[PDB]
């Protein structure tokens, strides 16, 4: 139903790319991750790999499996076998084509692995992963209970309208396994189904473009003296930086990508309610955070004297409150405001003396001046 589910997958085909470490050294594996985005506030990761999955080799809709280019052939394994982690194992959420949506924790790098029919293969790429917790409270995992605040998260819906990327025909793919010295001469299989592009640096015949024919090549002592490329010219590939381009032409178009970042609602912790102690032109606040929580305060005067601090350990702080007004915001709790008025000792009759020092506290900045 619709080209979004039909997918350009039928046109593309997964491909291979170099990984920094494949276990014992580097290799040209399809698991290679092209790019990673970490803009979602909920901690989900959107990985772009060199392979494609969600549709099988025949183009049928099957999200249970994943498709990887195993050297000269293409194999498919169940998606549930594929695992990935950064500091701890991640949870795969969804996938479509090149892109993968998973719940990864914080970490310094992303490692993805899957079990082949042999020793398991893995690949790690350096990328800073650090998701901003939703809200003014810095949590590691979402709480059981909380208030609903607006956030931006990666939608799992395959619906795609805005974003798109450029894909184009891949370049010539060298394959030295095509060529051998049958008895003493260069012999190359096409093979059955692929056109064999062969060119020699030495003299004689330097162009083959052999579609389907077993040919012998003289004046080539060793098979190292020749080079051979597999040409498909049937499908497009993502504009990857690890596969060489075709020099003849770059047939290209625009193709949309899944897992768009979209607005949503998130569950956030609620900063514990502090204890409030009253006094003369002063409020005593007993803070007891469950996690690092930002405390922000301001006055309602012309001089706000804005003060803020991330507080993770219990502590009691005192702030001065004038009749002009003082606002209080604590984590995700709705902002509260408190004003101040004449507390004590005031200005009673108190004859004599006494009232002089009582007036000292009322309307300061002067008082002593008049005396």
């Amino acid at each position: 139903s619709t080209e979004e589910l039909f997918n350009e997958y039928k046109l593309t085909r997964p491909y291979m790319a170099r990984c920094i470490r494949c276990a014992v050294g580097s290799c040209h594996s399809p698991i290679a991750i092209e790019a990673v985005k970490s803009d979602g506030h909920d901690g989900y990761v959107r990985l772009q790999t060199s392979s494609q999955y969600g549709l099988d080799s025949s183009g049928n809709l099957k999200g249970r499996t994943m498709r990887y280019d195993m050297h000269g052939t293409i194999k498919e394994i169940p998606l549930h076998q594929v695992s990935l982690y950064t500091s701890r194992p991640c949870h795969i959420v969804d996938g479509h084509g090149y892109f993968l949506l998973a719940r990864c924790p914080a970490g310094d790098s992303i490692t993805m692995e899957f079990k082949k029919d042999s020793v398991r293969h893995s690949c790690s790429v350096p990328y800073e992963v650090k998701f901003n917790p939703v809200g003014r409270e810095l949590y590691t995992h979402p709480p059981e209970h909380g208030v609903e605040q607006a956030c931006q998260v990666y939608a799992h819906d395959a619906q795609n309208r805005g974003a798109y990327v450029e894909m184009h025909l891949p370049g010539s793919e060298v394959d030295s396994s095509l060529v051998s010295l049958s008895g003493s001469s260069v012999t190359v299989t096409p093979p059955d189904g692929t056109s064999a592009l062969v060119e020699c640096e030495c003299g004689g015949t330097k162009i083959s473009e052999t579609i389907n024919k077993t040919k012998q090549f003289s004046q080539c002592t060793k098979k190292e003296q020749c080079r051979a490329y597999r040409l498909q010219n049937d499908k497009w590939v993502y504009n990857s930086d690890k596969l060489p381009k075709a020099a003849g032409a770059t047939l290209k178009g625009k193709l949309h990508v899944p897992f768009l970042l979209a607005d949503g609602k998130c569950t956030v912790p609620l900063a514990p309610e502090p204890m409030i102690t009253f006094g003369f032109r002063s409020v005593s606040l007993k803070l007891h955070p469950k996690n690092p929580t930002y405390l922000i305060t301001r006055q309602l005067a012309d001089e706000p004297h804005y003060t803020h601090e991330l507080i993770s350990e219990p502590a009691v702080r005192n702030f001065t409150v004038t009749e002009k007004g003082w606002e209080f915001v604590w984590g995700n709790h709705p902002p509260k405001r408190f004003w101040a008025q004449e507390t004590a000792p005031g200005n009673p009759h108190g004859l004599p003396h006494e009232v002089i020092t009582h007036y000292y506290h009322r309307y300061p900045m002067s008082t002593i001046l008049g005396l």
Binding site: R18, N132, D241, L300, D302, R337
Partner: protein, 98 residues
Amino acid sequence: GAFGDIQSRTVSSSDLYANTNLVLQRPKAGAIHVPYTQAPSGFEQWKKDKAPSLKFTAPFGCEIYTNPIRAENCAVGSIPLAFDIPDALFTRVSETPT
């Protein structure tokens, strides 16, 4: 590496300004890849150093709301009022209790 390294006149505008200090490097011998040099995304750096918002810092208890960009409950100043009321709406004392 600064806020606004990538600018676009409008959301739908295809033309855009880019200043990333992109420098190409020498590739590794025997390895096919496209080496490059670029400044870190200034958007991310600004997001990290974004500082408290105007909504939290605005004086006079002014509250800031978005979409129809507006300021509310700004307790500063005073507003004069003029009331042109017709005499027909006035009531004579003889109709009111004494």
